[PDB]
Structure formats: C-alpha cells, structure tokens
C-alpha cells in the first residue's frame, strides 16, 4: 500500500530514505513505514508544482473541472478501499469511513470540480475610456500541511478549492496518517491529474512542514493545527510573505436551552463530540445546559454515552474507535487527570477502557465531565470524545459562556425560540453556528475559524477566493489624458 | 494645526509625552511637534476602539455610510486647508494635493460611503430542512499602519473600506507626514463620528508600529511599507493571529513597445515615475523601451524630465517638490551613485538641484538613468523621482524584464496591438496591470500586490472582504436525521 512520498507523478523515497513508523491505533502495531519527507524532498516537490503550474493553470477552469469530478466518481469507486485503508490507520470506524469520510471527500471534490469554471473575475466601473476587468488568478504553488483527524476528508477541503484555481500543491500530511492521502493522489494521476500538479509529501512538522512553510517558491501555506505551531506557520511565512491560511482549532459551544427538543439535543450533542473520537476541532466539547433540562438531558446523554460501543475500528459494529496517536490518548488522559484534580466530577467514562481487545489500542472512553466554565479543560481542546457539561440560567449566561474562550471555529444551540437562536448565532464569536444540528459542514458553506481559531475560510466561493488573486487589467481606450505635466 | 494623538475623541499627548518633530520637506524648519505614540498610546487607542466597536458595528450599514459620506463632502470643504496641510508636511506639490491627494482621498471615502450597505451575505444551498445563511461582519478593531507617500489618501484607502465594513480603527501614520490624518479625523468628528471609532496614533514603528501589529485585541494589521519591515508584521502577527493585509513596494515595469504612441507613453512614464517625486510604489520606475523606438523616445522624455519645475510645494506650478524625508533624500542619492558605481548612465538627473535656493529641502532631480535589467536600481525599489531604463527586442524580452524581479505590485505596458496588449497584461505577475495608461487607480478598482508586493486588496468590495469575516450560521427548521449513534 503506497508508502512512499509523490513526487512529479511517481512514488519515491525520501532522498535521503528518512522513515516513519505508521501504526494502527488500535493495537499500537505497525501497519507500514511510509517515506519521511524532509526539506531537501519538498524542493523537489515544489519544484515539481511549479514547473506543471502553468500548463494547468492555463488548461482551462472546465479541465480542471472534469478531473474533479474525475476524481469525485474515481473515489466513489474506491469508497471501501479506502475507507478500509483511512480507518486502519486512523482508527475511524469503518461506519465512519464508508459513510462519512468517504463521501464527504467525494462530495468536497465534486463540488470543486464544477466550481473551476465558476471562478469569475469582474469587471470594474471606472473613468470613461477606460477598461478595467480584474481576474481572479491562481496564487501559483501552494503549500498544504494537514492534521490527523480526518486525513481522507481534508485532502478534498485543500486540495478541492486550491486545484479548482488552478494552483499546484505540495501538501503534507501528518506522519500519522498518511497512507490515505497516498492513495488519493495515485486516483488523482489514475483519473488523469498531471504529473506534478499535486505532490505529496509527508514527514515530520518540523521538516517538510517548516520547508514548506518557508520554501520561496510557494504563495500561499494552509495549515491546520495546534495554535502553537501556526504561529510557527506564521512566522515562517516571513520567509517571502506567502499569503496563509490557518484553522487552529476549536472548543465548541454547544448550548442547550429550557426548550430544546432534549432527544434531539442528547443525539446532536453525543454526535457532536463522540463523533470521530472528539478528534475534530468543530467537536461540541462543552455541553452547556440550561439548569431547567441539565438533569433531564443529563440523563439521557450519559447513558448514550455509556452505551456507545468502543472498539475495532474495522467492525462496522464500532461507533467509536481509539484516538489516532497513543500521544493523544495520554494528553486525553492527563486532560482528564487534570479536569478530575480541578474539581470536576466524571459522569462517564474518564479513562482507557478495560476490555483485553483494547488494551494495545488507544482507546478512551467517552468521557462527560461535569465542570465549571473557569476549568481548564473547559477553555483548552481536549481533542477527544470528552465534553465538559457546565449549567446556566439565562441565555445570557450561556452567551458569556460561549464566549468565554479563546477559540472561535464552531458553535450550536438549540432551541425553538426564533429569537433566541438568531440573537445568539449572531452573538457567538465562532466562524460557524449550528441551530438544533451540529458539525454540519457542506462544501459550498465557508468553514473557518475567528480570532485565535485562525482566519481563512475551506468550502464554497470563500475559499476559492483564498487560493486566487486579484490581477486588475487597465486598458486606455478612449481616454482623455491630459498631460500631468502641461507640455 | 493638530499635533497630538488622537484617542477617544479627543486630542491628547502621548503617555509618555513623547514627541517627533514635523519637518517641511522643502527647507526643513520645523511645522510642528507631534505627539509620539507608544505602546502605551496604542493600548489607550485599541482600547477606545474596542470600547467603541459594539456600537458602531451595529450601527446598520446605511448608517457608516452616511457618515462616510459626510467624510467626503466634508473633506471636499476643506480641501484647500487639507491641500495645502498635506503639501507642506508631505513635499506635495499643492497641484497634487489639490488635484490628486484630496480629491482621491474623497473619492474614496464616497465609494465606501455607498459600499457600506451593499455589503452582503449569502445563503447556501445546503440540504434539504436545512437554513445555511452566511453573514459578512467586521473583524473588530483593526490596526492600520500608512507610510508617509501619501499620508492624506491613505487615510481613505485603508479606513474606507473598514469602517465602512463596521470595525473600528487604530490608524498610525508615519511620524513623517501625521498632521493630515490628524486632521482628518477632527474632520471626522466634525461630521458625526462615534468617539473611539477612529483613533489615531502617530509614533515611531517600532513603538506604535510594533505594539499595533502584537496587540491582542486588533483583528487584522494592514500594514504598507517596506518589504522588511512587513516581515516583522507578520513576526508580530502571531501574537494572536491577526490577519494581515500588506502592501510591500513595486518595482513598475513601464513597457514601451515598438508601435506604442510614443509621445503619449512620455507623458505617461513622465506621470508613472515623476508624480509624487516617484514616491509611489506602483511608479514606473523601470522604463522598458523597444531598441526601435528607444532613442525617439529618450529624446521626448529626457527633455521632459529635465524641464521639470522642482521647487517650493506650496507653488502650484510647482511640477515636482522635494522628497518627503532628508533621509529618503540620501538613499536616493545613494541609489544614484551605485546606479553609477555599476555602469549606468545618467541621462538627466543624478543629484540634488544646483539651485541653492532648493538647497535646505530635500530635493532631488527627476533623474533618468540607462542601465541592465541586472543591476540593483532596476531590481531594487529606488522610492524617488528615479527611472532606470533598459532596451528589449521582443515581447519576451519585454515579459522576461518586467518579471524578473521580487515585485509584483504595478506594471504597464504601451502598445496598439489587441493581442501584446493582452498577452502582456496576463503574464506580467503584478496585482495590477496598465495599458496606455499607468498609475490609474479607482475606488473600486482593487489595488495590491502579488508575490513578496504582499496580498491583500485595497478598493472594492476585495477590500471589503478583507475587512470582514465569513460567520456561517446554520438552522435546522424541518429536516431531521438520523442519530449517528441508532440506539
């Protein structure tokens, strides 16, 4: 199973046959040694995406399109393989793989494949005799560091919009999980992708990841991650002032208030969080219930929680697997350490499962953590299936709550006020804001971040907008121009 | 004349007391001293600013426009006060203040006036049951730092757009040329201006400057300046991860082809590279000329540069004043000599006027000089009244000059021929691109620089997007799903 880096079309090692141990979570086992990129094979890669950007960025927005599209059906085509490959790597349920990952990543590039030739430019009312028309045109060569969360998913959210523009990238994948974004650029050559105009490149942050992020030769560097190395993302961007992008994480405010449809509430809310083992930043890690229904919905939620069935992530009998890395698991479990010695009270889970079958896996259970808005654990991401459930008494309580982070990317609610829902989506500080739904994504709906969770925006026109630039033609046609200096 | 910051509605010292002194380009004595802002200045404004934001940012757009509006009628009032406080501080020749700096700066401040209300949203078609609508809201408070070119317009250009989008605003002009966005701000509150909405906040940058581009508070830091000190933006960005927008320099290609209309290309490269004293970083600083046409055209456009009124700003048939700085004055002389050191020559130009009458001023001679596209003034942003001129043979030739540089902000060409015209337009990699024409700037014409010239867009409703940010919210009316957890 394709374990090397993708360079101008062909699978290679690092040049200097750097590794990488790629383990399952389950078990902790191997599953491959994939190539560690490192800065010397991002030169290539670079040099690869720019010497193919301008047969592509001229081939025509509906070329580009078509293999999109390709690309979606191709996907489709391969939804078991890969979903079997994405989950053995990540840990996702397999339920997760075949029906969300999958399609969701099919979905994303189909989008951006009719979106190529939908990128329009304008044309400005300017002095009489003049023309002024202003393209919208590729940045040129992109950089693209993905987490490890949804590794199969977020090559279509980067690579949908960037390639529909008609820029070409070097993206890097965590050295986590890799294997599925190997796969897909191999579809993306299959379908009829020029060599070159995706590389991919996995390795160590602090090799491929700071080549890229630094490299002259590339406009723009997305990145998703922690905030702390997306300051780092940033400060590299120095280097020759390429235009960033940076999702930096989220900690979902997810309220619930006096007449919120409670079933539909607990259901969105265990969804929201225990969804991909809480590993995604727009997760609903802090339940904040209106302390008329806490203990009603409490009820339910707990025991939904307590139920959920743990486990191998091939079974399409799990609905939740074990965290991707064992490092995780431990930071999940020093977070809950931490949230227990603050005086929170577990009401589920709160550590490593006990089954023998699980033992070498990294496994959490799905923890609910009953806390105050002041706890640590209910300001910092906890980045799994843990929510912390705090109590309010007005909605304006519950706004402060909500607000009362550093982080900005997702938020819900529910209730059945008209009011209330739009007076606080308005209100929350978060890119995004579910109403009796959560972490509902579509790839034409912008996703981003505010303040410290970043600034740019996946999906939709936004983020076409964020891979192009504004190249404004004059033209003097029948212009009157006096001399500046009469004669 | 207004000499303190201004914070708050109110016009007030530096904590610290601090000053600079404001000096007349042409015979250097002393206008005023200037109230020099530091970091706790900039606390005290950001705070004003914040403090001011809620109010303003639900102000309802009709309602920043029609304050906008006032701005700029009020603004073509007092347009000879504001012409000729911007030529005495700036070196401005107050044909230029009057004709282009204050009308441009209403201009703009109209267009944004009446782009207030016509920023707007979108709904996205997501599925069924589901409301997706996306709002444009303001990012908050916004840091603005603007060199001393063109003090007075650049106060609408970056405060135009964002506040027209409902942030509020911490602007800090160059200690250099402060005294005319003083005054515009009192032309603010003059009109009906919140207090804190504008603050400004002259000072140094490495103690305004560098606390507005750290602070926690601000949104986004537009910065135009030099390429090196937009690094240390960027550097100083991270602290919170503001957004940025900048605008590094140009170094203007100002092509010339063989069957251009030479006499009217003269008057545009004479335009391009003399207006402002060349201090203007989408000059034309890099005259291109068709070996054919070359010496007709040297011929018309020596005798221009050479027949240039330098002298006293505040003499409207003053064609040329000083520049700004006594040390922008020395770079550019060193410019000169090293665009000497390394061959060129000297076609007109070269030193400060022999007139010892324009002697304590910082003058320097529109100077023209005949060089490789190799050498560093043609590679390197001069920022006076400085054109190096360099001699091609075909388009590609021409393409291959004007490129070869770190810049993209400007660039334009001359010709009749439909096709060069277009074929140039779309391979020169600059934000924006003039034909027959240059230095042609629209409200609503977005203005920016590509590669390390920056990112980011001025004008339009481009800026406006850069001004705002994308908040998704999400309604579940009428169409449920499944639990993802069946049970």
């Given at each position: 199973?394709?374990?090397?880096l993708?360079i101008?079309?062909?699978?290679?090692?690092?040049?200097?046959?750097?590794?990488?141990?790629?383990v399952?979570?389950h078990?902790?086992?191997?599953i491959?040694?994939?190539?560690?990129?490192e800065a010397a094979?991002?030169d290539?890669?670079?040099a690869?995406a720019k010497?193919?950007?301008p047969?592509?960025?001229?081939?025509?927005?509906?070329?580009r399109?078509?293999?999109?599209?390709?690309?979606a059906?191709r996907?489709?085509?391969?939804?078991e393989?890969?979903?079997?490959?994405?989950?053995?790597?990540t840990?996702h349920?397999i339920r997760?793989?075949?029906?969300?990952?999958?399609?969701?990543?099919?979905?994303?590039?189909?989008?951006?494949?009719?979106?190529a030739?939908?990128?329009?430019?304008?044309?400005?009312?300017?002095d009489?005799?003049?023309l002024?028309?202003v393209?919208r045109?590729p940045?040129?060569?992109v950089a693209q560091?993905?987490?490890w969360?949804f590794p199969?998913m977020?090559?279509?959210?980067?690579?949908?919009?960037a390639?529909?523009?008609?820029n070409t990238?070097?993206?890097?994948?965590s050295?986590?999980?890799?294997?599925s974004?190997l796969?897909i650029?191999?579809?993306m050559?299959?379908?009829?992708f020029?060599?070159?105009?995706?590389?991919v490149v996995?390795?160590?942050?602090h090799?491929?990841?700071?080549?890229?992020?630094?490299?002259?030769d590339?406009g723009?560097?997305?990145?998703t991650g922690?905030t702390?190395?997306?300051?780092?993302?940033?400060?590299?961007?120095?280097?020759?002032?390429?235009?960033?992008q940076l999702?930096?994480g989220?900690?979902?405010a997810?309220?619930?208030?006096?007449?919120a449809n409670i079933?539909?509430?607990?259901?969105?809310?265990?969804?929201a969080?225990?969804h991909?083992?809480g590993?995604?930043?727009?997760?609903?890690?802090?339940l904040?219930?209106h302390?008329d229904?806490?203990?009603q919905?409490?009820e339910r939620?707990?025991?939904?929680?307590?139920?959920?069935?743990?486990?191998?992530?091939?079974?399409?009998?799990?609905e939740?697997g074990?965290?991707?890395?064992?490092?995780?698991?431990?930071?999940?479990?020093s977070?809950?350490?931490?949230?227990?010695?603050?005086?929170?009270?577990?009401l589920?889970?709160?550590?490593?499962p006990?089954?023998?079958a699980?033992?070498?896996?990294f496994?959490?259970?799905?923890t609910?953590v009953?806390?105050?808005?002041?706890?640590?654990?209910?300001?910092?991401?906890?980045?799994?299936?843990?929510?912390?459930?705090v109590?309010?008494?007005?909605?304006?309580?519950?706004?402060?709550?909500?607000?009362?982070?550093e982080?900005?990317?997702g938020?819900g609610?529910?209730?059945?006020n008209?009011?209330r829902?739009?007076?606080?989506a308005?209100?929350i500080?978060?890119?995004?804001?579910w109403i009796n739904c959560?972490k509902?994504?579509?790839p034409?709906?912008?996703?981003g971040?505010?303040?410290?969770?970043?600034?740019?925006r996946?999906?939709?026109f936004?983020?076409?907008?964020?891979?192009?630039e504004?190249?404004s033609?004059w033209v003097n046609?029948?212009?009157?121009?006096?001399?500046?200096f009469?004669?």
């Open positions: 199973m394709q374990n090397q993708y101008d079309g062909r699978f290679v090692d690092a040049v200097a046959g750097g590794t990488i141990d790629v399952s979570p078990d902790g086992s191997l491959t040694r994939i190539a560690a990129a094979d991002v290539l890669a670079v690869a010497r193919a950007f047969a592509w960025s001229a081939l025509g927005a509906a070329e399109g078509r293999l999109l599209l390709k690309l059906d996907i489709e085509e391969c939804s393989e890969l979903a079997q490959l994405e989950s053995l790597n840990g349920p997760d793989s075949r029906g969300l990952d999958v399609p969701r990543t099919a979905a994303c590039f189909r989008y951006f494949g009719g979106m030739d939908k990128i329009e430019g304008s044309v400005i009312p300017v009489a005799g003049f002024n028309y393209q045109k940045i040129g060569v560091i993905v987490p969360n199969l977020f090559t279509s959210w980067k690579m949908g919009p390639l529909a523009a008609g990238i070097v993206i890097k994948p050295e986590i999980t890799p294997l974004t796969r650029v191999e579809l050559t299959e379908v009829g020029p060599k070159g105009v995706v590389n996995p390795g160590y942050g090799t491929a990841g700071q080549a890229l992020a630094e490299h002259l590339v723009k560097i997305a990145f922690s702390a190395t997306g300051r780092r993302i940033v400060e590299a961007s120095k280097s020759n002032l390429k235009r960033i999702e930096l989220g900690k979902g997810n309220i619930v208030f006096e007449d079933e539909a509430a607990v259901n969105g809310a265990a969804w969080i225990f991909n083992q590993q995604a930043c727009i997760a609903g890690s802090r904040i219930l302390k229904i806490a203990d919905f409490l939620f707990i025991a939904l929680a307590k139920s959920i069935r743990l486990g191998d992530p091939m079974d399409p009998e799990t939740m074990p965290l991707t890395s064992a490092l995780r698991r431990d930071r999940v479990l977070y809950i350490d931490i949230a227990i010695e603050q005086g929170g009270k577990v589920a889970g709160g550590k490593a006990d089954d023998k699980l033992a070498n896996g496994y959490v259970e799905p609910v009953e806390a105050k808005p002041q706890d640590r654990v209910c300001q910092e991401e906890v980045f799994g299936p843990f929510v912390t459930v109590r309010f008494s007005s909605d304006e309580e519950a706004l402060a709550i909500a607000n009362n982070t982080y900005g990317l938020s609610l529910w209730t059945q008209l009011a829902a739009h007076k606080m308005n209100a500080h978060a890119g995004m804001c959560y509902r994504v579509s034409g709906s912008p996703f971040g505010v303040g410290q969770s970043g600034y740019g996946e999906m939709g936004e983020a076409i907008h964020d891979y192009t504004a190249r033609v046609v029948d212009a009157k121009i006096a001399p500046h009469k004669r």
